[PDB]
Design a binder for this molecule. Structure first.
Ligand SMILES: Nc1ncnc2c1ncn2[C@@H]1O[C@H](COP(=O)(O)OP(=O)(O)O)[C@@H](O)[C@H]1O
Ligand SMILES: [Zn+2]
Lengths: 105, 49, 966, 104, 99
């Protein structure tokens, strides 16, 4: 279902269009619980639910409110595999050069 | 469907045991992984027709 | 194709009614169900919704409730608007924006699948129907079933489970004596509410030790977990969320943690829980002069939790006022003045004879009828009393309702709950042993000069000081004086445990330092390993000690517990006990003894207590053993008995030289104790515990529930569901089967399975023996997940089945219709107990005649066998137009049936709500301290629920074709 | 990620351990036609295993899949018949080691 | 925790344990075949998983009689054989078991 392929330099709006939300905090886990800190590097609402068909708040459970963004934790209810493709983006404070086009040699 | 596609592997096994001989038409997920890899870089790498 | 104003139906959640498209986003959509009034933010992707279609010529109703006849539909900007002819006035050309439709759906019939060439196989309809039949009953089952626990069935346990677990916003005093099992009963309540869905957010505050026990027990038996919020978890939940706690659902949190800061208490308060669980509620220090900070904090919790569970092991140790205060927390309107409960008990002393005579089936003298009327403050008595007195046709339930009313003006027998062990079968034995020892002269020298300024201490304080002669000896002879060297107690217990080297023993002292030094002595001198429980041990250390002492197979031989160490840990494996220092006040020693007197004892408890001669120990032993006999027995009357001779008793103890006139005091105390026991057993109690156990009728009810648990249908249904899923099953033989994922599982990952597999047993008793394997039930999460998966699996329903009847005409068509009767309302209105989605089975021949009631589904099911695919569908659907006609008959023949099904739960709601209102008004008239706006509001809610339940409807969920060959 | 052997460009070229594979030493096959490859029993009951499952559960000899697995591993005589049925016409691909030609 | 060579193994029929010894090692001269357990070996059920409630469980210790995953070494598929000898080797400080 895929004719010829196209490659081009990505516009910033294109990049932000390749995301549901923006990461804003470097964090991995609680180190006490499995807490995916809000706006963390593995943020639940930017990437998906850590466990299949669940909300981090735990309100909904495993099929009933499928594909629901939990009003409290703000997370879709879908399979953990959805985490595999949901891209994110970090907004840069200042414009920053892309090395690849700087050093194509 | 016989190297890495877990979903394809399972679907094909279902079809074989169910008595249906049929692959599932669709781009292998390896293409999707590569596409997201490129999109990590600021490259459009879009599809076409 | 989403747009503002559209109406959609949720796929899985058909019970929310029609949803309005409030707003859309690039990847999200905010919908609202006005019938439930609930907003839901769905992801635009994955489409967990559906746009039900009113085809031209169908009929619709606007929110105002006037029907119409749709004739055209137009679409603009991906938004649909209808045009139709009214049915009330037959006005054509009436246009409706779809936003103004009803808020609850009575449509989305599946016949379009049949008329569009879409059908399924026979193994997609029977399972659906039976799953629906099992699931609908859950909301009106015998408490949705109460077999989903790893508990040995006990009459009062299951009676309490059934009673409390089917009541909105329960609030009771679970005060069963120590070790009978109150955590288990409370877990039954919690699990029942959770399974029913009536409660989802709960609170659990327990002492420091009880946290881990509660958590592990509930997970191991009820498969329930409640996150524990320490300082770190609470702090990080703050550092993320505005309200930290509310992210989770069920919680463990110590009142120590809770009362640390006022804002923390406010955050706990504003979390909108459903049920509150408080363990050992006796600690709550109520005082009309000055209530404690902990007490008023828990009072705020009670103010902002609809449900509360008061669990206390000592309802009366703090005197009568604390008990009244706890009941006042449960019911301030009823328990408003402290001076009335005693009069109530004195008045109910003889009253049990009335209920005894009534249960005998004999007639009641009208003189006693106008005393039963005196007890209950109502004037609608005569209509019920005449019907029940003559044993009318309604007497089987009218008598039950009458005794329920008598309970209601007795105190409901519900805010209070007790279970004894005398009449309650199941007490192994409590043997007592006493040993007298010579008092060493060193402590004599210490205590002779102990009193110089010590008179500043009160007699209570003097007895408290005498509780630790070792510590006063240290005080006189420098701290850590060699007190343990000249102790006949040390040698006595050394010999005692020398007799019991191959056995475990629970030794308990009065403080941490005592336990430390005693463990030092035992380990260093005799090399005897003893697991201490001093306060210097963190909760993790307490758990470690409990575990080592619990490893009966090569575990700690001795468990040394300080005063606080006498917590609710289960030491049923330990059948022997030792009282080291002979604690002063009774109820503390009662709790200590009850630490072992639990279920699962290897043998009866025998208690040993070495006491030195000529000291307060002898006086206390004699008094407890003879004056009250509080050791061997469990008669709960010491609260005021201790108070009555309190001053003289403490004077005797603080002045052991005073011994004249003690036997007569003991005799009078025993006279009072036996007279009080006779008064209590005659009436004012001992029928409350009958209600707690519910009598042999409740025993038979529990037995019926247990036989239901013994039903083997679930085993076959779940096994075949697993086989359809593709879950590998391997049996061990001892009612143990391991389930594991397989290469051919329908989903890559399932919630309740892992790569290692899990063992399960369907038997209660084996599960009790083997805590490893889960107790699979309709209540177990795995079965619930599978049931919801199949229910949400809208694929199926349609079938192509063959029936081999050589003596029935060929080509005969039988349609099996499974409709659903549903009502829409918020979860907080708890329609589950009144009207859930309910299946309706119909069996129609060509002429639309019903055969559902003439033959049951199961016997019918063996005959069916599916036959060839789509060629068959075409061949049989060559005349499929008749199905469109069949509905007009089937509906016409089942719509009335739906009415017959609609007429039922109205009584269920009306009777109970009217009874609660009657009790409220009867109590209010006596006590003018109630807010009339609240009762106006609950009357309004009564009207609301009645009228809403009067609204209903039935929809089609499944249809099966059956053709009879030869 | 886009470079080296683990580079996800040159990944489906290095080589894939395909399933339903096999191997053996070779033996002459007179009495065969010119479109028949004598395949062993012990290797044809581990290649067409899922096909056997399908034709077995469908025939009802063992409806549940785990029963079908335990039947094939039990060498029950019926499984030989079912395997013969499935391999009635189900071409196999025989590939020599260096596949220079397109006939290889 | 350590790996256990006990004969006790979950999710295995009595047929497998029929020829083993109590320790978990097959007897000499046992006409093994494909799939039979030569040595009964097991591992202690994975690692720290689930949630901090799982850490709570570890603090309280789990509640599993089995509490061990099956990792027994069986005959490789497709080879018969008659066991001649079974040597046992022990790290110093490990008490020798029954076999
Ligand atoms: N039905 C039962 N089945 C198994 N164990 C029980 C049952 N009832 C009570 N127990 C045991 O009794 C112990 C005490 O119960 P709990 O209510 O926590 O304290 P108490 O009974 O002293 O109030 C529990 O640890 C539990 O193991
Ligand atoms: Zn959520």
């Amino acid at each position: 279902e895929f004719d010829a392929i196209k490659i081009a330099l990505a516009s910033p709006d294109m990049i932000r269009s390749w995301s549901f939300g923006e990461v804003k905090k470097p964090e991995t886990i609680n180190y006490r619980t499995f807490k995916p800190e809000r706006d963390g590097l593995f943020c639940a609402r930017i990437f998906g639910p850590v466990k299949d068909y669940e909300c981090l708040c735990g309100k909904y459970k495993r099929l009933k409110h499928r594909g629901v963004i939990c009003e409290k934790c703000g997370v879709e209810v879908t399979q953990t595999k959805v985490r595999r493709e949901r891209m994110g983006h970090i907004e840069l404070a200042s414009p920053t050069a892309h090395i690849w086009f700087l050093k194509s040699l | 469907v016989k190297s890495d596609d877990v979903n394809g592997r399972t679907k094909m096994y279902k079809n074989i045991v169910d008595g249906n001989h049929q692959m599932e038409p669709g781009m292998p997920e390896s293409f999707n992984v590569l596409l997201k890899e490129i999109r990590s870089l600021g490259i459009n790498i879009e599809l076409e027709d | 194709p989403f747009t503002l104003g559209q109406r959609w139906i949720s796929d899985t959640e058909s019970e929310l009614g029609l949803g309005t498209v409030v707003a859309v986003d690039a990847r999200t959509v905010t919908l609202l169900f006005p019938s439930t009034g609930e907003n839901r933010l769905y992801a635009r992707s994955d489409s967990p919704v559906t746009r039900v279609m009113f085809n031209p010529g169908d009929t619709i109703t606007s929110h105002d409730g006037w029907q119409m006849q749709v004739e055209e539909v137009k679409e603009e900007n991906g938004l649909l608007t209808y045009i139709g002819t009214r049915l009330d006035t037959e006005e054509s050309g009436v246009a409706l924006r779809e936003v103004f439709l009803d808020s609850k759906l009575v449509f989305s019939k599946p016949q379009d699948r049949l008329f569009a060439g879409q059908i399924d196989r026979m193994d997609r309809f029977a399972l659906r129907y039976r799953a629906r039949k099992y699931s609908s009953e859950q909301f009106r089952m015998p408490a949705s079933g109460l077999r989903g626990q790893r508990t040995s069935l006990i009459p009062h346990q299951l009676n309490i489970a059934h009673d409390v677990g089917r009541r909105h916003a329960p609030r009771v005093l679970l005060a069963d004596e120590v070790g009978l099992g109150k955590t288990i009963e409370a877990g039954m309540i919690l699990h029942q509410q959770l399974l029913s869905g009536a409660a989802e957010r709960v609170l659990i505050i327990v002492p420091e030790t009880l946290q881990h026990q509660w958590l592990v027990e509930m997970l191991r038996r009820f498969n329930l977990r409640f996150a524990l919020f320490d300082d770190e978890r609470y702090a990080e939940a703050q550092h993320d969320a505005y309200n930290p706690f509310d992210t989770e659902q069920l919680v463990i949190c110590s009142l120590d943690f809770a009362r640390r800061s006022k804002q923390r208490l406010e955050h706990l308060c504003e979390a909108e829980w459903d049920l509150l669980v408080v363990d050992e509620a006796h600690h709550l220090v109520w005082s009309e002069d000055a209530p404690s900070r902990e007490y008023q904090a828990i009072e705020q919790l009670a103010e902002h939790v609809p449900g509360v569970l008061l669990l206390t092991a000592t309802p009366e140790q703090l005197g009568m006022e604390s008990h009244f205060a706890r009941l006042r927390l449960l019911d301030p309107n009823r328990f408003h003045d402290f001076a009335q409960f005693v009069e109530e008990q004195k008045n109910y002393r003889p009253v049990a004879d009335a209920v005894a005579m009534l249960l005998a089936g004999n007639k009641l003298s009208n003189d006693e009828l106008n005393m039963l009327g005196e007890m209950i403050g109502e004037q609608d008595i005569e209509p019920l009393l005449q019907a029940a007195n003559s044993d009318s046709e309604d007497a089987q339930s009218a008598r039950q309702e009458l005794v329920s009313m008598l309970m209601d003006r007795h105190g409901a027998s519900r805010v209070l709950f007790r279970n004894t062990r005398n009449g309650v079968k199941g007490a192994p034995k409590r043997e007592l042993h006493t040993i007298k020892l010579p008092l060493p002269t060193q402590y004599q020298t210490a205590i002779k000069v102990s009193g110089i300024m010590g008179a500043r201490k009160s007699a209570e304080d003097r007895a408290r000081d005498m509780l630790y002669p070792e510590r006063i000896y240290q005080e006189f002879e420098g701290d850590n004086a060699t007190w343990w060297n000249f102790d006949p107690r040390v040698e006595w217990l050394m010999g005692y445990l020398t007799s019991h080297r191959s056995q475990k023993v629970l030794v308990i002292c009065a403080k941490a330092a005592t336990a430390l030094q005693l463990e030092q002595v035992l380990r260093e001198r005799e090399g005897i390993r003893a697991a201490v429980f001093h306060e210097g041990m963190s909760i993790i250390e307490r758990d470690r000690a409990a575990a080592w002492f619990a490893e009966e197979d090569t575990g700690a031989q001795v468990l040394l517990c300080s005063e606080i160490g006498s917590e609710g840990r289960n030491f049923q494996f330990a059948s022997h006990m030792v009282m080291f220092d002979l604690p002063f006040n009774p109820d503390l020693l009662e709790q200590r003894i009850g630490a072992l007197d639990r279920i699962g004892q290897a043998h009866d408890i025998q208690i040993h207590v070495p006491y030195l001669e000529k000291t307060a120990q002898s006086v206390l032993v004699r008094w407890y053993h003879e004056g009250l006999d509080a050791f061997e027995h469990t008669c709960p009357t010491g609260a005021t008995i201790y108070d009555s001779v309190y001053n003289d008793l403490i004077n005797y103890l603080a002045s052991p030289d005073q011994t004249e006139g003690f036997d007569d005091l003991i005799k009078n105390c025993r006279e009072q104790h036996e007279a009080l026991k006779a008064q209590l057993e005659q009436g004012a109690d001992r029928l409350l515990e009958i209600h707690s156990n519910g009598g042999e009728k409740a025993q038979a009810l529990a037995e019926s529930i247990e036989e239901q648990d013994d039903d083997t249908a679930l085993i076959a249904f779940a096994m075949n569901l697993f086989d359809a899923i593709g879950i590998n099953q391997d049996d061990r033989g001892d009612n143990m089967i391991v389930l594991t994922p397989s290469d051919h599982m329908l989903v890559p990952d399932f919630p309740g399975l892992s790569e290692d597999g899990i063992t399960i047993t369907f038997d209660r008793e084996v599960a009790l023996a083997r805590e490893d394997a889960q107790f699979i039930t309709w209540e177990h999460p795995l079965i619930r997940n599978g049931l919801d998966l199949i229910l949400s699996g809208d694929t199926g329903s349609s079938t192509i089945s063959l029936l081999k009847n050589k003596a029935l005409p060929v080509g005969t068509l039988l349609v099996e219709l499974i409709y659903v009767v549903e009502a829409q309302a918020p979860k907080q209105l708890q329609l589950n107990r009144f009207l859930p989605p309910t299946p309706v089975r119909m069996l129609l021949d060509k002429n639309g005649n019903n055969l559902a009631a003439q033959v049951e589904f199961e016997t019918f099911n063996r005959q069916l066998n599916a036959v060839n695919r789509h060629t068959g569908s075409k061949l049989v659907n060559a005349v499929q137009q008749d199905v469109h006609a069949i509905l007009q008959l089937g509906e016409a023949q089942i719509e009335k049936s739906a009415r017959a099904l609609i007429d039922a739960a109205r009584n269920e709601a009306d009777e109970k709500l009217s009874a609660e209102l009657s009790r409220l008004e009867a109590l209010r008239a006596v006590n003018p301290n109630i807010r009339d706006d609240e009762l106006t509001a609950i009357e309004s809610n009564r009207q609301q629920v009645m009228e809403s339940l009067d609204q209903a409807g039935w929809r089609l969920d499944a249809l099966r074709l059956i053709v009879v060959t030869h | 990620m886009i470079k080296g052997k683990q580079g996800r460009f040159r990944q489906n070229l290095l080589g894939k351990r395909v399933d339903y594979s096999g191997r053996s030493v070779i033996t002459v096959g007179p009495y065969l036609r010119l479109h028949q490859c004598g395949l062993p029993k012990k290797m044809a009951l581990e290649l067409f295993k899922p096909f056997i499952y399908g034709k077995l559960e469908l025939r009802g000899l063992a409806t549940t899949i785990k029963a079908a697995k335990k039947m094939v591993e039990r060498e029950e005589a019926v499984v030989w018949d079912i395997l013969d049925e499935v391999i009635r016409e189900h071409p196999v691909l025989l590939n020599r080691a260096p596949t220079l030609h397109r006939l290889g | 925790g350590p790996e256990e060579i006990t004969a006790d193994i979950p999710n295995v029929g009595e047929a497998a344990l029929s020829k083993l010894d109590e320790s978990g090692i097959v007897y000499i001269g046992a006409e093994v075949t494909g799939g039979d357990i030569l040595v009964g070996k097991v591992t202690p059920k994975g690692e720290t998983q689930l949630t901090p409630e799982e850490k709570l469980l570890r603090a309280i210790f789990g509640e599993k009689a089995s509490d061990v995953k099956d990792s027994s070494l069986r005959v490789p598929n497709g080879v018969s054989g008659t066991v001649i000898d079974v040597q046992v080797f022990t790290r110093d400080g490990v008490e020798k078991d029954k076999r």
